Design a protein around this ligand. Structure first.
Ligand code: HEM
Length: 424
């Protein structure tokens, strides 16, 4: 909240010769500089080739074509046969023998992708979903109420106390994980998530051990449900079937490992950026708090467009492609910069305005559409809606009180800490 900002302010004009998408220094600049770089790219070099970020001492891989236009990103997403998701969806995979272990369906192309996603989807039965919906409400209500008891001074970090724990507690609830086990699930998850942070010194040996441990935890959980039926997603996964194919315990473990990353830190960063935007632009909070259920759908969609928690996804070309007269070769990597498509001057009027009533809103924060479209998009929209509903009811004047501590990442639009304050 700290620095005053006027809703609708465009980014500074960033000279093309100043943009270094392969430098880590670039990803450390503030959001205005980044938004201004991509604005320059959309105008002057909308498809361009970049080397990967190189951490001195480690293999970096080959470079990538940056797609910065909403129409280009949509096209790529609609043609998975040309733009493959296998081998992986990050610029450079550091553990390629474990690509499928961590990635589950997101690193598969068809037909393997559709087969797996079909079986996983059918496990989300009406009963399992109704339990998830009660969990979202219960968990958000308890976490906000805990912030109030744990902080008589009326100050806390939104990330550690709410935005961090809510998405993971909800994943634990749908898997049927006991309360007692959360500590270990959280510690393992945090170590996995930390392995990308260059402000942390995370041991690769430790990363492997926690990765195997959470996977062994998950296969044992699924095996328990094979003998003991419960009303949880774990049991629905072991029982689900499509054309006679069922899921092994290892496949369920890999999907769980994907959830505690892809379904977790994404939602966390949508919540934190949503809090930050509602703090910077208080008229939007006032409007939202005045008609909460009636503006919730457009408000949530704008929080996702604004936050773009997933900054990009990578693809790999199976054949040559010429689009916008830019020739890209089979085998090249391509990156889909959702953070740029969600400011594309050709799709959104007033793109620099955070508008909780915005409509239409063809935002691509859940991806550009198609085969890999976020499996949890409606679950994420619900988590966002419900957490701000509980803040609105319990501490309506809560506001960010400091600029965020930002995660240094090319992939995740991360907030590490976000101080907030409220009154009673
Ligand atoms: C604001 C929150 C979230 C954002 C921004 C987000 C974004 C994304 C994106 C960009 C993709 C790739 C889309 C593509 O390649 O076309 C994806 C896929 C996926 N997401 Fe989400 N996600 C969010 C929350 C969630 C949640 C809550 C869940 C479930 C708990 C989830 C589960 C998945 C799965 C399983 C996939 C893989 C689908 C596939 O490969 O077919 N995500 N998500």
């Amino acid at each position: 909240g700290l620095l005053p900002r006027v809703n609708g302010t465009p980014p500074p004009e960033v000279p093309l010769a100043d943009i270094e998408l392969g430098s880590l220094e670039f990803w450390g600049r503030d959001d205005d500089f980044r938004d201004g770089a991509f604005a320059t790219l959309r105008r002057e070099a909308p498809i361009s080739f970049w080397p990967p970020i190189e951490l001195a001492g480690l293999t970096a891989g080959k470079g990538h074509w940056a797609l910065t236009k909403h129409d280009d990103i949509h096209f790529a997403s609609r043609h998975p046969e040309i733009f493959h998701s296998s081998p992986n969806i990050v610029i450079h995979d550091q553990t390629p023998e474990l690509a499928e272990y961590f990635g589950s369906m997101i690193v598969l192309d068809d037909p393997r992708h559709q087969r797996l996603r079909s079986i996983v989807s059918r496990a989300f039965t009406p009963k399992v979903v109704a339990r998830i919906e009660a969990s979202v409400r219960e968990r958000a209500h308890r976490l906000v109420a805990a912030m109030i008891e744990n902080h008589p001074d009326g100050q806390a970090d939104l990330v550690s106390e709410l935005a961090g724990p809510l998405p993971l507690q909800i994943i634990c609830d749908m898997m049927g994980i006991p309360e007692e086990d959360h500590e270990q699930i959280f510690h393992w998850t945090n170590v996995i998530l930390g392995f990308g942070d260059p402000d942390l010194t995370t041991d690769f040996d430790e990363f492997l051990q926690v990765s195997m441990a959470i996977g062994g935890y998950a296969t044992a959980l699924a095996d328990d449900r094979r003998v003991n039926h419960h009303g949880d997603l774990t049991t629905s996964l072991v029982e689900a079937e499509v054309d006679g194919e069922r899921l092994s315990s290892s496949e369920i473990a890999m999907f769980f490992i994907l959830l505690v990353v892809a379904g977790n830190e994404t939602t966390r960063n949508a919540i934190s950026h949503g809090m930050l935007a509602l703090s910077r632009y208080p008229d939007e909070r006032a409007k939202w708090w005045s008609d909460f259920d009636g503006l919730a759908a457009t408000a949530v969609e704008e929080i996702v467009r604004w936050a773009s928690p997933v900054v990009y996804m990578r693809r790999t070309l199976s054949q040559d492609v010429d689009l916008r007269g830019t020739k890209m070769a089979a085998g090249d990597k391509v990156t889909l910069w959702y953070c740029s498509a969600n400011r594309d001057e050709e799709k959104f009027a007033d793109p620099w305005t955070f508008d909780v009533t915005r409509n239409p809103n063809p935002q691509v924060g859940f991806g550009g559409g198609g085969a890999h479209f976020c499996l949890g998009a409606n679950l994420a929209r619900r988590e966002i809606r419900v957490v701000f509903d509980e803040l609105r009811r319990q501490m309506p004047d809560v506001v960010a009180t400091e600029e965020p501590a930002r995660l240094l990442s090319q992939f995740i639009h991360g907030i590490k800490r976000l101080p907030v304050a409220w009154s009673r």
